[PDB]
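Priority: medium. Attachment 1 of 2:
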């Protein structure tokens, strides 16, 4: 799966309670943390 620190196409494409978002230019969508202890 896509780590919470690698480019992705959708927040769903990320193991654990991680999400994916782009920059101000709606580009460079990178995965991020969400809540390992409490989602």
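Attachment 2 of 2:
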């Amino acid at each position: 799966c896509i780590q919470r620190h690698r480019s992705c196409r959708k927040s769903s494409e990320c193991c654990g309670c991680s999400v994916c978002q782009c920059n101000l230019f709606g580009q460079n969508c990178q995965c991020k943390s969400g809540g390992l202890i409490a989602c």
